[PDB]
Design a protein around this motif. Structure first.
Motif, PDB file in Angstrom:
ATOM      1  N   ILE A 100      30.303  40.754  11.148  1.00  0.00           N
ATOM      2  CA  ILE A 100      30.321  41.631  12.433  1.00  0.00           C
ATOM      3  C   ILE A 100      29.460  42.914  12.443  1.00  0.00           C
ATOM      4  O   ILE A 100      28.930  43.343  11.365  1.00  0.00           O
ATOM      5  CB  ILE A 100      31.775  42.082  12.360  1.00  0.00           C
ATOM      6  N   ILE A 101      28.920  42.896  13.544  1.00  0.00           N
ATOM      7  CA  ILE A 101      27.937  44.017  13.766  1.00  0.00           C
ATOM      8  C   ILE A 101      28.638  45.313  14.246  1.00  0.00           C
ATOM      9  O   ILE A 101      29.257  45.132  15.407  1.00  0.00           O
ATOM     10  CB  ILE A 101      26.913  43.977  14.917  1.00  0.00           C
ATOM     11  N   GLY A 107      35.125  41.175  25.308  1.00  0.00           N
ATOM     12  CA  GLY A 107      34.288  40.712  24.466  1.00  0.00           C
ATOM     13  C   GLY A 107      33.724  41.589  23.333  1.00  0.00           C
ATOM     14  O   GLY A 107      32.545  41.698  23.093  1.00  0.00           O
ATOM     15  N   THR A 108      34.528  42.706  23.222  1.00  0.00           N
ATOM     16  CA  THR A 108      34.170  43.734  22.170  1.00  0.00           C
ATOM     17  C   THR A 108      34.294  43.140  20.788  1.00  0.00           C
ATOM     18  O   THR A 108      33.870  43.938  19.711  1.00  0.00           O
ATOM     19  CB  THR A 108      34.883  45.154  22.241  1.00  0.00           C
ATOM     20  N   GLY A 109      34.947  42.051  20.496  1.00  0.00           N
ATOM     21  CA  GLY A 109      35.084  41.330  19.266  1.00  0.00           C
ATOM     22  C   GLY A 109      36.442  41.589  18.505  1.00  0.00           C
ATOM     23  O   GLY A 109      36.455  41.639  17.276  1.00  0.00           O
ATOM     24  N   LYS A 110      37.812  41.673  19.192  1.00  0.00           N
ATOM     25  CA  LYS A 110      38.949  41.760  18.980  1.00  0.00           C
ATOM     26  C   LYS A 110      39.129  40.333  18.152  1.00  0.00           C
ATOM     27  O   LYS A 110      39.994  40.520  17.209  1.00  0.00           O
ATOM     28  CB  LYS A 110      39.893  42.132  19.753  1.00  0.00           C
ATOM     29  N   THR A 111      38.831  39.462  18.769  1.00  0.00           N
ATOM     30  CA  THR A 111      39.082  38.171  17.951  1.00  0.00           C
ATOM     31  C   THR A 111      38.305  37.778  16.521  1.00  0.00           C
ATOM     32  O   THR A 111      38.973  37.182  15.534  1.00  0.00           O
ATOM     33  CB  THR A 111      38.963  36.919  18.962  1.00  0.00           C
ATOM     34  N   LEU A 112      37.027  38.318  16.767  1.00  0.00           N
ATOM     35  CA  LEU A 112      36.261  37.905  15.612  1.00  0.00           C
ATOM     36  C   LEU A 112      36.817  38.860  14.159  1.00  0.00           C
ATOM     37  O   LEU A 112      37.184  38.399  13.187  1.00  0.00           O
ATOM     38  CB  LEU A 112      34.990  38.598  15.791  1.00  0.00           C
ATOM     39  N   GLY A 150      29.332  42.667  22.811  1.00  0.00           N
ATOM     40  CA  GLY A 150      28.909  41.910  22.292  1.00  0.00           C
ATOM     41  C   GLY A 150      28.840  40.516  22.911  1.00  0.00           C
ATOM     42  O   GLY A 150      27.845  39.672  22.573  1.00  0.00           O
TER      43      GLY A 150
HETATM   44  N1  LIG Z   1      30.283  43.511  16.833  1.00  0.00           N
HETATM   45  C1  LIG Z   1      30.030  41.911  16.861  1.00  0.00           C
HETATM   46  N2  LIG Z   1      29.367  41.228  16.040  1.00  0.00           N
HETATM   47  C2  LIG Z   1      28.933  40.039  16.172  1.00  0.00           C
HETATM   48  N3  LIG Z   1      29.445  39.355  17.333  1.00  0.00           N
HETATM   49  C3  LIG Z   1      29.941  39.746  18.346  1.00  0.00           C
HETATM   50  C4  LIG Z   1      30.466  41.063  18.062  1.00  0.00           C
HETATM   51  N4  LIG Z   1      31.215  41.437  19.300  1.00  0.00           N
HETATM   52  C5  LIG Z   1      31.118  40.219  20.105  1.00  0.00           C
HETATM   53  N5  LIG Z   1      30.552  39.347  19.513  1.00  0.00           N
HETATM   54  C6  LIG Z   1      30.327  37.954  19.818  1.00  0.00           C
HETATM   55  O1  LIG Z   1      30.927  37.838  21.178  1.00  0.00           O
HETATM   56  C7  LIG Z   1      31.710  36.822  21.471  1.00  0.00           C
HETATM   57  C8  LIG Z   1      33.319  37.119  21.762  1.00  0.00           C
HETATM   58  O2  LIG Z   1      33.685  38.097  21.052  1.00  0.00           O
HETATM   59  P1  LIG Z   1      35.368  38.135  21.043  1.00  0.00           P
HETATM   60  O3  LIG Z   1      35.801  38.154  19.480  1.00  0.00           O
HETATM   61  O4  LIG Z   1      36.073  36.963  21.607  1.00  0.00           O
HETATM   62  O5  LIG Z   1      35.882  39.399  21.691  1.00  0.00           O
HETATM   63  P2  LIG Z   1      37.180  39.670  22.391  1.00  0.00           P
HETATM   64  O6  LIG Z   1      38.364  39.365  21.400  1.00  0.00           O
HETATM   65  O7  LIG Z   1      37.202  41.246  22.887  1.00  0.00           O
HETATM   66  O8  LIG Z   1      37.377  38.684  23.418  1.00  0.00           O
HETATM   67  C9  LIG Z   1      31.920  36.178  19.833  1.00  0.00           C
HETATM   68  O9  LIG Z   1      31.580  34.757  19.649  1.00  0.00           O
HETATM   69  C10 LIG Z   1      30.856  37.028  18.791  1.00  0.00           C
HETATM   70  O10 LIG Z   1      29.868  36.163  18.689  1.00  0.00           O
END
Ligand SMILES: Nc1ncnc2c1ncn2[C@@H]1O[C@H](COP(=O)(O)OP(=O)(O)O)[C@@H](O)[C@H]1O
Length: 286
Positions: free
Chosen positions: A32-33, A73-78, A216
């Motif tokens: 994660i970034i 797209g902020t990375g809540k699922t990641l 992200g």
């Molecule tokens: N901080 C981060 N580091 C690396 N990749 C990220 C980051 N934030 C978003 N991404 C990329 O964006 C995509 C969607 O992120 P996601 O986890 O679905 O966020 P959200 O839960 O807000 O929809 C992921 O496939 C990931 O590769």
């Protein structure tokens, strides 16, 4: 499928389709970034109580439910899967909308099966949509949750204020998830551009600066667009036919150039509205 768990239904299809044992997802928190403070919170709230349970009891009882609020797209699922990998947690990914289309018999098995797999994490995306007879889940969650409380339930919302009081109750802890800053953007661009043929002419600092309000997902969308702008930059008629031509052979040698980002920079635009990030920042305080 640890020891013995069987129950007749065609629902086992979907539940096992959303499940990921601690073996399946080899995810890393270091994949994660940024999100230092968000990783720090989930690490102390999920991972540490499982490694030092003598410490995390009584007045240090761990949280059972948590909600991640931030722009899309902020990375809540990641971070949900990354913290489940760091803590040997069985992962369950469940979108709120996907339930309303697919449902009450899933939620029961979802929790029953999550409790079956020692420590497990149930991730719920877009829970703001939950709060027609979808009352069979929009409340069946609350009865399966108030009883399940081992099993940590991380929830995600892009609209945190559209969260009714009935759900605000069950999710006391609220983590605000922000947009990647200039530095995290740069590493995100370089990470997305990892194995793509490109010219050294590209400077990832200008890109990090030009993409102010980007998330992200917007950055990786900017990268996918620049990569395919190489195809757009090509002469169309040469790439025609159902048979392989020398022009298509030349398509492979092509590098992503500054022009490709320039075109993509005028194509993709940030999906995180201005006043929409503050909508989460203030809501995580009141
Ligand atoms: N901080 C981060 N580091 C690396 N990749 C990220 C980051 N934030 C978003 N991404 C990329 O964006 C995509 C969607 O992120 P996601 O986890 O679905 O966020 P959200 O839960 O807000 O929809 C992921 O496939 C990931 O590769």
């Amino acid at each position: 499928s640890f020891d013995a768990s069987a129950y007749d239904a065609y629902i086992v299809q979907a539940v096992r389709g959303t499940m990921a044992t601690n073996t399946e997802n080899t995810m890393s928190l270091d994949d994660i970034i940024g999100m230092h403070d968000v990783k720090q919170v989930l690490h102390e709230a999920v991972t540490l109580p499982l490694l030092v349970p003598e410490f995390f009891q009584g007045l240090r009882s761990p949280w059972k439910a948590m909600v991640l609020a931030g722009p899309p797209g902020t990375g809540k699922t990641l971070i949900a899967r990354a913290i489940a990998s760091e803590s040997s947690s069985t992962f369950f990914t469940v979108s709120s909308t996907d339930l309303s289309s697919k449902s009450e018999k899933i939620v029961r098995l979802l929790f029953e099966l999550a409790r079956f797999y020692a420590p497990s994490i149930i991730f719920i995306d877009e829970i703001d949509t939950l709060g027609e007879a979808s009352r069979r889940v929009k409340s069946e969650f609350l009865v399966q949750m108030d009883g399940s409380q081992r099993v940590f339930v991380l929830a995600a919302t892009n609209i945190p204020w559209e969260l009714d009081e009935a759900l605000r109750r069950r999710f006391e802890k609220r983590i605000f998830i922000p947009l990647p800053d200039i530095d995290a953007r740069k590493k995100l661009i370089e990470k997305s551009m990892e194995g793509t043929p490109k010219s050294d002419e590209i400077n990832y600092d200008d890109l990090a600066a030009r993409t102010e309000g980007f998330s992200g997902a917007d950055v990786v969308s900017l990268c996918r667009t620049a990569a395919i702008n190489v195809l757009r930059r090509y002469d169309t008629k040469s790439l025609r036919g159902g048979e392989l031509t020398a022009a298509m052979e030349s398509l492979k040698a092509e590098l992503v150039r500054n022009i490709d980002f320039e075109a993509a920079l005028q194509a993709v635009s940030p999906s995180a509205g201005p006043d929409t990030m503050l909508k989460c920042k203030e809501w995580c305080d009141s």
